[PDB]
Amino acid sequence: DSRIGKLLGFEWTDLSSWRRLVTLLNRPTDPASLAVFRFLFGFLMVLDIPQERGLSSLDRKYLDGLDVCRFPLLDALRPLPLDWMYLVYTIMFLGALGMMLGLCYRISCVLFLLPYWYVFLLDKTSWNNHSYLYGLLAFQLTFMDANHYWSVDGLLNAHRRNAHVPLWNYAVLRGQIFIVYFIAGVKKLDADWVEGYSMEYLSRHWLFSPFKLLLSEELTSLLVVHWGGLLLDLSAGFLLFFDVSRSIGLFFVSYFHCMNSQLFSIGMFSYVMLASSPLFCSPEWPRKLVSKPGLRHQLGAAFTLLYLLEQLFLPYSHFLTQGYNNWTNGLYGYSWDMMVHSRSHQHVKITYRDGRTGELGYLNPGVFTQSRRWKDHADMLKQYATCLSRLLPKYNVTEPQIYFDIWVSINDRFQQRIFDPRVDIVQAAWSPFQRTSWVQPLLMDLSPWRAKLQEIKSSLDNHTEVVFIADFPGLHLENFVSEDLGNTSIQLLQGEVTVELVAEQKNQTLREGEKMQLPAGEYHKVYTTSPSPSCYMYVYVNTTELALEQDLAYLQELKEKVENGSETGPLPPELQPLLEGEVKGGPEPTPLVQTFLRRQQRLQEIERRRNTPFHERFFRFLLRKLYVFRRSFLMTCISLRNLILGRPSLEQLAQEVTYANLRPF
Amino acid sequence: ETDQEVFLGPPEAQSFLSSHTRLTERFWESYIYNG
Ligand SMILES: *[C@@H]1O[C@H](CO)[C@@H](O[C@@H]2O[C@H](CO)[C@@H](O)[C@H](O)[C@H]2NC(C)=O)[C@H](O)[C@H]1NC(C)=O
Ligand SMILES: *[C@@H]1O[C@H](CO)[C@@H](O[C@@H]2O[C@H](CO)[C@@H](O)[C@H](O)[C@H]2NC(C)=O)[C@H](O)[C@H]1NC(C)=O
Ligand SMILES: *[C@@H]1O[C@H](CO)[C@@H](O[C@@H]2O[C@H](CO)[C@@H](O)[C@H](O)[C@H]2NC(C)=O)[C@H](O)[C@H]1NC(C)=O
Ligand SMILES: *[C@@H]1O[C@H](CO)[C@@H](O)[C@H](O)[C@H]1NC(C)=O
C-alpha cells in the first residue's frame, strides 16, 4: 500500500537480498503484450528482408568474378558464393516467418539471429542504429517465452498455451527502449545540435507548414526541430513508464515517429518503435481489447543486469577502441547518435607511385568499391589501401605506394584534410587499441567563423560559387583550373599563404585581405608558410554556362517574338527546327538547338510530373514494391534450383534471368 | 575494369573546383534506394 510500491511496482525490501531480487524478477505475468510485439516485429522483419537487407540487389553485390574491396570487421570473414548467400537469406526469411507465427520459436529465433549477425559483421558500410536495434531485439527475444499466447505452437501443444512468463522478459525490453531514447537524447546534447546547425534545412518541408503560422522559419528550425527532439527523447524515455503520463507520452511518440517515417527514408525503424511503444502498458492489455529459487531463475536476473549494464556502457566505450576514433567517435551504428553530424566531401585524390620504375599516376576515387564510407575512417582506408596494393599488379603496376588526399567538412565548417597526404597507407601503422598517427586534428578553434562565412554566402550573385579552405602549415595544394571556369579569384582570410603559377614559375606571398585572379586552364599551387593554419577561399564562376544561358535566352526571346506576331521577316533556317520540333528531312541541328529542345522537353516533363494525381502515385508505388518482391522470389528460386538439381545450360539460365527481371505490368 | 575507369590523367585528377551543371547532407542513417 506504499506509494513507492504503487508508482514503481515494487517495494524497497525486494532489493534487500539476492534471493528477494530473484523472486521479484521471476514473478508471473500475462504473455499477451509480448506476443503482440513478437507478431509485429516478425511481420516488420519479413517486410524488411527483401527491401533494405538487399535480397533484390544481391545478384549485383556478390557477383562472381568481380574484384571488389570488402570492409568487414575482421579480415578473416569472407563472403560465400552467390547461391549460398541466397540460401542464407532463405534461412533468415524462414526464421522471421517462424518468429511471426510463433512456430518452433527457439529454432526460428536462432535461424534469424545467426545469419543476420553474419551479414551485419560482413560489411561495416551498411551499419546503422536501426539494424543494431533489430539484432539486439532478436537476441533478447531468443530467450523470452513469447509463444505462450496467440501462436501456432499453443494450438499444437497444450503445455505452452496461455502460460505465465517472468517479469524480466518485460524489464529487458523496457530497459532497451528507455536506453535508446535516453542515450539518443544525451548524445544530442552537442554544441552542433542545441544551436541549430545539424539538420538546419528540415524546416522547409510541408509537414512543418502549421508551425509557420505562428513562428518564423528560423525559430521553427530551432525550437521545434532541434530542442523539441531532445526534449521528446528524454520525456518519451521517462513518461511511458508512469501511469499518469502514459497517454500523453504515447501521443507524442506516435506523432514524432509518424513524422520521422514521412520525413526520412530510414525504413522500418519508425514502425518498430511504434510497435514497441505499447510495451509499457499493463501486460494484459490485448486481452481486454478482445473481450529456494532454482538455476534459471538466477540466470535470468543475472542476464538482465549484465545486459543492461553492457548496453549502458557500450556507447561510451570509445576510450578503449581508439583505433576507430576520428573527428567523430567510433564506428557508426551503436552510439545512438542519429542525425547529429553532416558531411560534404569536396575532393578526393588517390596517387600511386610504382616501386620499380618510379612513375607517378592517379587512380579513380571510388574504384573497386561499392560504398563511400571509406573516406572518413582510418581502418576502412587501410583496408582499401591493402586491397588496391593486391589488385594493382593485375594492371602492370609493381609494388605501389598509395597516398590519399581527402577534403571533408562537418556541419558547414572549413574544408580541411582528414588524413595526412604524405604518408604511405600501404606501409602505415594501425592497431585497434592505439591512436592513429596520420589523422589530422579537427580545427575546432575555427568554430565561430561559421557565422561570418554565411554572410559571404549571402553576398554572392546568382551564378558565383565559393569554397572555403583551411590548411595546415608545411602542406600545399596543387590545383588545375579548368578552361570553362574563367574569372576565378583567390582571397586570403586568415594567415599567410604563397600562390605559385607554374607556367612562368612566379609566386606571390598573400596577406590578409589580398585578392588574386588565377589563370584559367593552367596549374597553380598554394603553399602554407605560417606557424598557424591558414584559411582562404575560392570564388569562381562558370563562363561557358553563362554564355550558353545568355545565348539560349536570346534564342527563346526570338522564338517568343516570332510567336507573338513580330519579326515579320523570314525565319533563319536554324529557327525552323524550333517551330517544327522534329529533325526530319533536313540538316543536323546545331548543338545550341539540341540543348534548347532538350531543356524544353525536360521542363515539359517536370510540369507533367507536377500535375499528377495522388492515386496514380500510390499505384506506381505499389507496383514498384510488387516488382521488388517478385524479383527477390524468382532469383531465390533460381539459386535454390541451381544448388539442389544442378545448373542448366547457359541459354536456359539467360532465359530465366530475363524472366526474373521483367516488369509486372 | 579496363584502363579508363581505374586511371585518370594528371589534368583531370587535380581539378579541385567543380561547379554545378556538371543536398550534400549525407546522414549515414538512410538506406540507399536501389531496386
Ligand atoms: C568575376 O569576379 C566576380 C565573381 O568571381 C564578379 O565580380 C563582381 O563584379 C560585379 C560587377 O559590378 C559586382 O557587382 C560584384 O559585387 C562583384 N563581386 C565581388 C566583388 O565579389 C564577376 O562575376 C566577375 N568580375 C569580373 C570583373 O570579371
Ligand atoms: C615559391 O615559394 C615557395 C614557398 O616555399 C617555394 O617552395 C618551397 O619549394 C622548394 C622547391 O624549390 C622546396 O625546396 C622548399 O622546401 C619549399 N618550402 C617549404 C616550406 O616546403 C617555391 O620553390 C617557390 N617557387 C619558385 C619558382 O621559386
Ligand atoms: C561548367 O559549366 C558547363 C556548362 O556547359 C559544364 O558543361 C557541360 O559539361 C558536361 C560535362 O559533364 C558535358 O556533358 C556537357 O555537354 C557540357 N555542356 C555543353 C558543352 O553545352 C561544365 O561541366 C561545368 N564545369 C566545368 C568544370 O567546366
Ligand atoms: C599492360 O597492361 C595492359 C592493360 O593493363 C595489358 O595489355 C597487359 O596487362 C600489359 N601488357 C604488356 C605488353 O605489358
Q: What is the helix fraction of residues of chain A, given as a range?
A: 40-55%
How many domains in all of chain A?
6
| Attached small molecules | a molecule of 2 linked components (NAG-NAG), 2-acetamido-2-deoxy-beta-D-glucopyranose
**Radius of gyration of chain A, CA atoms, in whole angstroms:** 31 Å
Number of H- or I-type helical stretches of chain B? 1
SS strand fraction of chain A: 5-15%
**Main pleated sheet of chain A:** 4 strands, antiparallel
According to DSSP, the number of beta strands of chain A is 12
Q: Please give the oligomerization state of what you see.
A: heterodimer
Number of separate strands of chain B: 1
How would you characterize the largest beta sheet of chain B?
none
Shape of chain A: globular
> Proportion of β residues of chain B?
5-15%
Cα-atom Rg of chain B, whole angstroms? Answer: 15 Å
Classification by helices and strands of chain B: little secondary structure
Helix-residue proportion of chain B: 10-25%
Structural class of chain A: alpha+beta
Give the termini separation of chain B: 24 Å
Family (chain A): Belongs to the vitamin K-dependent gamma-carboxylase family.
Protein name (chain A): Vitamin K-dependent gamma-carboxylase
Glycosylation sites (chain A): 396, 487
Membrane topology (chain A): Multi-pass membrane protein
